[PDB]
Design a protein around this nucleic acid. Structure first.
Ligand SMILES: Nc1ncnc2c1ncn2[C@H]1C[C@H](O)[C@@H](COP(=O)(O)OP(=O)(O)OP(=O)(O)O)O1
Ligand SMILES: [Mg+2]
Ligand SMILES: [Mg+2]
Lengths: 345, 538
DNA sequence: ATTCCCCCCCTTCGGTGCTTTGCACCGAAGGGGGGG
């Protein structure tokens, strides 16, 4: 369990820290100062060359700021249909019991982060973890391997279905779509805090011929075109490849997403619409869409997709942290090219 | 003497070794200077005499420091630096004088001999060896090994800063009211305590620093305003940049113009509406940093304008957390923008400018939403909070852009000031085909090898033109048949291209671009009333 | 003729990726300014 190492060939994260707000910096300071006295993190110096970005989020409970570390390179560099119950399989979070298992001493130097300061009045204050953090891909494995002794007391005489997840939120699988809001969370209450043109457009849409489904003609469709007229299922996901997610903005706060493994072979397709509300806050809808697709890839497949967001880089980097309310931070590129061909999807 | 601070454990990248670089010849002046600085630093215990270790030697040199007649001894450690482990730098940026509140009690204090006061790891002092040369010619030359932090190593900056922090920390727990800005070893101490009472804590901070062997000389102890801090002349209620002297010359070499652009970029954070684009375009092409560039006409009046802004004195003000942050952006033409952050009219916190061209073809709406993202992050850096904007664009002009753009784009809480010139989109493309319009099927293609391409169009009433062109491309020719569909049609025209490149360049409403072809298309998309476009792959 | 870190701007040049083997975008590196 404890003995963990890095995928052979690379060194460790060296990501810089983006600026933050006082409402976030103060929360991070009050969280780090409190954690230091519990022996969860420890101050370090510049002699550690590693760095991962940090920030804080207000979870939906809206009672306290939770800390978040952009532990993405530390997962990309680390080596090592059961939920058909109901539909939107749902659960809370499991990240506060993670502190009961210490990090390996040889490993702690990689999980280093920096706390910035307003107006840059003081050089950044660096810390490194001492217990298993939240957001590292191995941490659920090291924790589960020894703590599965508690993944049975909640069962007792309860078959239920499957469960599991990826980062920290151990999702459940209760088929019961009733109950007192699933009041059966008694052992889950334990061992968590106490360790333990019409023709033109239509032929355009027929360019989606052999691309998606091989074997089409699209010739009698263009019989009334190309001249001089007045313009007046069965998907295959190999569990070694990465699911890819594509998002397109279609106006009026309507977004379309398609999860595909290979190009033009989509395993999932959907449309997320929020109409007005966020209204001008489009970045809040996209960010919500991202927390909508991702968990879906978790419930049915298991791994987060790589998102080709239709947003600009700077806008996303500036505003994505404010609306984020998820422990995972998926990976994403940015589509700098009109995915608006000719009224498709 | 040398601070009793613990040392930072430093190793070398696994496998590399110390620098055996020779000691390049030095002028007798700098020889005397070096021997004097080195003799005193020897007695203090800063540099220890070296014997028969390995033959590690890094060269030495010496420059005149600040405006003083003192010399700074430095060491070319490029070779050690390349083989020394990597360090995460802690300074995440420089402090700006407009994120500081007005304070009745403020002192500027500087640690003297800052680097040569922190210890250096004993198991690394060897590699820092040096050979002060001989005053005569070949006299052996005393050689020493640095015991303190060297002024030229890569880890020295980070080690001093992280250490100065652990020295100021116990003093910060005792004084929550005090406000300390520590940039390296420069200290800005401010509180709203009584002047007589304040001084008494500036006599106690000094003793706390001295307990860790950090002398604070009372010659560089600024006690009364106007303080000189971070290049700024901070008076008690107003702050300004120290005097900026723009070079005045007849011939303008490339380096002189680079210096002018740098000074005007530094002078644009307080002075309003500084432009450098007409001068920054004299640096595109020529790479000879000595070619005598002749000053044009489009840059001479611009330089004169920049000089007239720098005639009268301007000043900023201090941050007032109670009030509100406002940012007023003004378009200045040719892709240039200005902005002013303030809390009351005619009293600016800091001015600025935006003149970056991020892309090939872009309009003013995108160029404004980029400037908004710049001021937004600069404010999150300086004040930690997003200001409220006063953009000169109509609410519906931005609403139509937000709902007819495939990308997600935002501007935070903003408001519209009716001052010319308002940002606007110069043309629009219809949703559905226009009834009773001449239809133009345009197609242009070339031969990669021969470089000449033919481009033409076919219409619904006989008209059919085809034109050849040379030095073309299978995309640049296609974007020319459209230009032939705009140069013959009336005020209403329907265009049916066949290229995904042609549409994307056209469907983003550009108003200016480098391509003379795209600009010529834009010019004729403006004089046209209702243009329409579509793509069909036949 | 000599150095080191940090922030910024402006220009140049080489990956990169989709494609339309060319064009557009992006990061890194020269130069300049400022600070210590
Ligand atoms: N030109 C430089 N080259 C390299 N390092 C420098 C340079 N200027 C300053 N530093 C570094 C090392 C210095 O100890 C530290 C602060 O500089 P500074 O305070 O001006 O010098 P100092 O404290 O050594 O001399 P003084 O006695 O005049 O204060 O930053
Ligand atoms: Mg000093
Ligand atoms: Mg100084």
């Amino acid at each position: 369990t404890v003995p963990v190492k890095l995928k052979p060939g690379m060194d460790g994260p060296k990501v810089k820290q983006w600026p933050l707000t006082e409402e976030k910096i103060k929360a991070l300071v009050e969280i780090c100062t409190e954690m230091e006295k519990e022996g969860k993190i420890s101050k370090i110096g510049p002699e550690n060359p590693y760095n991962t970005p940090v920030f804080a989020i207000k979870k939906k409970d809206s009672t306290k700021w939770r800390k978040l570390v952009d532990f993405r390179e530390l997962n990309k560099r680390t080596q090592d249909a059961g939920l058909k119950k109901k539909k939107s399989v749902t659960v809370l979070d499991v990240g506060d019991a993670y502190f009961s298992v210490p990090l390996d001493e040889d490993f702690r130097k990689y999980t280093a982060f920096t706390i910035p300061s307003i107006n840059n009045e003081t050089p950044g204050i660096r810390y490194q973890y001492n217990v298993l953090p939240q957001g590292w891909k191995g941490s659920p494995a090291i924790f589960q391997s020894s703590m599965t002794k508690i993944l049975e007391p909640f069962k007792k005489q309860n078959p239920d279905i499957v469960i599991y997840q990826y980062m920290d939120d151990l999702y459940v699988g209760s088929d019961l779509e009733i109950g007192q809001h699933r009041t059966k969370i008694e052992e889950l209450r334990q061992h968590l805090l106490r360790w333990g043109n019409d023709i033109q457009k239509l032929v355009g849409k027929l360019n989606w011929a052999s691309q998606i489904y091989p074997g089409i003609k699209v010739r009698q469709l263009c019989k009334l075109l190309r001249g001089t007229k007045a313009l007046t299922h069965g998907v295959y996901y190999d569990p070694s490849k990465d699911l890819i997610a594509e998002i397109q903005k279609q106006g009026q706060g309507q977004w379309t997403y398609q999860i595909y493994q290979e190009p033009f072979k989509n395993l999932k397709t959907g449309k997320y619409a929020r109409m007005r509300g966020a209204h001008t806050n489009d970045v809040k809808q996209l960010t919500e869409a991202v927390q909508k697709i991702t968990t879906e890839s978790i419930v049915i497949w298991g791994k987060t997709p790589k998102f080709k967001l239709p947003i600009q880089k700077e806008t996303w980097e500036t505003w994505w942290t404010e609306y984020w309310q998820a422990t995972w931070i998926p990976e994403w590129e940015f589509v700098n090219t009109p995915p608006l061909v000719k009224l498709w999807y | 003497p040398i601070s009793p601070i613990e040392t930072v454990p430093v190793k070398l990248k696994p496998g590399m070794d110390g620098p055996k670089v020779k000691q390049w010849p030095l002028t007798e002046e700098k020889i005397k200077a070096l021997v004097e600085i080195c003799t005193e630093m020897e007695k203090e215990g800063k540099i220890s005499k070296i014997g028969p270790e390995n033959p590690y030697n890094t060269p030495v040199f010496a420059i005149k420091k600040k405006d003083s007649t003192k010399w700074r001894k430095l060491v070319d450690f490029r070779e050690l630096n390349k083989r020394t482990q990597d360090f995460w730098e802690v300074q995440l940026g420089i402090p700006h004088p407009a994120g500081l509140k007005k304070k009745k009690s403020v002192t500027v204090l500087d640690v003297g001999d800052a680097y040569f006061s922190v210890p250096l790891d004993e198991d690394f002092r060897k590699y820092t060896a040096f050979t002060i040369p001989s005053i005569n010619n070949e006299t052996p030359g005393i050689r020493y090994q640095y015991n303190v932090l060297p002024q030229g190593w890569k880890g020295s900056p980070a080690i001093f800063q992280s250490s100065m922090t652990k020295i100021l920390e116990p003093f910060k727990k005792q004084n929550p009211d005090i406000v300390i800005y520590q940039y390296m070893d420069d200290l800005y101490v401010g509180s709203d305590l009584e002047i007589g009472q304040h001084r008494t804590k500036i006599e106690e901070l000094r003793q706390h620093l001295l307990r860790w062997g950090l002398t604070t000389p009372d010659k560089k102890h600024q006690k009364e305003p106007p303080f000189l801090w971070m290049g700024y002349e901070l008076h008690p209620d107003k702050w300004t940049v120290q005097p900026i002297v723009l070079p005045e010359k007849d011939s303008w070499t490339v380096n002189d113009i680079q210096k002018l652009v740098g000074k005007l970029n530094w002078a644009s954070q307080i002075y309003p509406g500084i432009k450098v684009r007409q001068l920054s375009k004299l640096l595109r092409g020529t790479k000879a940093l000595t070619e005598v560039i002749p000053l044009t006409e489009e840059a001479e009046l611009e330089l004169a304008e920049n000089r007239e802004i720098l005639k009268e004195p301007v000043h900023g003000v201090y941050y007032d957390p109670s009030k509100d942050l406002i940012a007023e952006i003004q378009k200045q033409g040719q892709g240039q923008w200005t902005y002013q952050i303030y809390q009351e009219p005619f009293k600016n916190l800091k001015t600025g400018k935006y003149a970056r061209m991020r892309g090939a073809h872009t309009n003013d709406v995108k160029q404004l939403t980029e400037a908004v993202q710049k001021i937004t992050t600069e404010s999150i850096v300086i004040w930690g909070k997003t200001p409220k904007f006063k953009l000169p664009i109509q609410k519906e002009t931005w609403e139509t852009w937000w709902t007819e753009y495939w990308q997600a784009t935002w501007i935070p809480e903003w408001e519209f000031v009716n001052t010319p010139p308002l940002v606007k989109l110069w043309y629009q493309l219809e949703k559905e085909p226009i009834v009773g319009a001449e239809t133009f099927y345009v197609d242009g293609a070339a031969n990669r090898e021969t470089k000449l391409g033919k481009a033409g169009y076919v219409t619904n009433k006989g008209r059919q033109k085809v034109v050849p062109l040379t030095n073309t491309t299978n995309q640049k020719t296609e974007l020319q048949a459209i230009y032939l569909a705009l140069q013959d049609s009336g005020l209403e025209v329907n265009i049916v291209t066949n290229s995904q490149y042609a549409l994307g360049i056209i469907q983003a409403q550009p108003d200016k671009s480098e391509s003379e072809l795209v600009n010529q298309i834009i010019e004729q998309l403006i004089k046209k009333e209702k243009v329409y476009l579509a793509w069909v792959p036949a």
